[PDB]
Design a protein around this ligand. Structure first.
Ligand SMILES: Cn1cc(-c2cn3nccc3c(-c3cnn(C4(CC#N)CN(CC(F)(F)F)C4)c3)n2)cn1
Length: 274
């Protein structure tokens, strides 16, 4: 339990469609000497958004893993519920890699890739489908650790099904998520391939998945493009096996995409060889 009176707004960290993350000092002693935390809150007073936010909070609370942002608790002002989590001083991987592209080499990129795989494999064991796997949702803990930092779109698989139908980051979506709104471990694997692309292009704005797909061309055009095996290009200086991994994640057939256990095995091998 966290007291609103002891939660001191420090700075804006990020913003989404219906939420925002802030850096706060949590100090019961009242002299700004306590612990710095990250706080997620909703933008406005809504019921459909609030119901989704409560489900998201219970999803995060249920997760305990080295590569998943740590849940700390909740803060009530009932409405207006706030999610308290650990603050990761280096911020998003999307921004971090854009800022330090000169200093980060392929071994480091493969270290981050492996950790994303491990975090994803753990989601799988819980039957959770992330649905929003992108570098913007990965946070940097330190130079040797990244964590999946947001679960706003995360769904729980039905007990008897390998997919969840929910009626959007379209440039990261698998074809069946675009055509049939079907989300699975396999569509999270497709999105992982897009993350691998993002990392090996060092977040070059002109080479981003929206930039590239729009040049190759909206949901209707993207469906046709993917059906005709239009794909993101090979990033400049890409190691051969990393491009083959991307290609395999992007198979139109759900059943021919690799597993997260196997991606972790393959990425660790490519990294060890270099
Ligand atoms: C120096 N520095 C540190 C940070 C920092 C630290 N932390 N520690 C926890 C979370 C963050 C974040 C952060 C930024 N964006 N995000 C999100 C995407 C994701 N992970 C979640 N948000 C979703 C919505 F709540 F806004 F809806 C966007 C999170 N930024 C920014 N600059």
């Amino acid at each position: 339990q966290f007291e609103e009176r002891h939660l001191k707004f420090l700075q804006q960290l990020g913003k989404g469609n219906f939420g925002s993350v802030e850096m706060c000092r949590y100090d019961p002693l009242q002299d700004n000497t306590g612990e710095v935390v990250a706080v997620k809150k909703l933008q406005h007073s809504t019921e459909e958004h609030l119901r989704d936010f409560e489900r998201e909070i219970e999803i995060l609370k249920s997760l305990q893993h080295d590569n998943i942002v740590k849940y700390k608790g909740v803060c009530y002002s009932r409405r207006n519920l706030k999610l308290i989590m650990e603050y990761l001083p280096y911020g998003s991987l999307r921004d971090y890699l854009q800022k330090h592209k000169e200093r980060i080499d392929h071994i480091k990129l493969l270290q981050y890739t492996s950790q994303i795989c491990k975090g994803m494999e753990y989601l799988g064991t819980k039957r959770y489908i992330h649905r929003d796997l992108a570098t913007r949702n990965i946070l940097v803990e330190n130079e040797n650790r990244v964590k999946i930092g947001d679960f706003g779109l995360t769904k729980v698989l039905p007990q008897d099904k390998e997919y969840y139908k929910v009626k959007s980051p379209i440039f990261w979506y698998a074809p069946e998520s675009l055509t049939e709104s079907k989300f699975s471990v396999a569509s999270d694997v497709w999105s992982f391939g897009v993350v691998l692309y993002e990392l090996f292009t060092y977040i070059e704005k002109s080479k981003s998945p929206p930039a590239e797909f729009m040049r190759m061309i909206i949901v209707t055009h993207l469906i046709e493009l993917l059906k005709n095996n239009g794909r993101l290009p090979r990033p400049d200086g890409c190691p051969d096996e990393i491009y083959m991994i991307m290609t395999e994640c992007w198979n139109n057939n759900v059943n021919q995409r690799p597993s997260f256990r196997d991606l972790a095995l393959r990425v660790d091998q490519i990294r060890d060889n270099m």
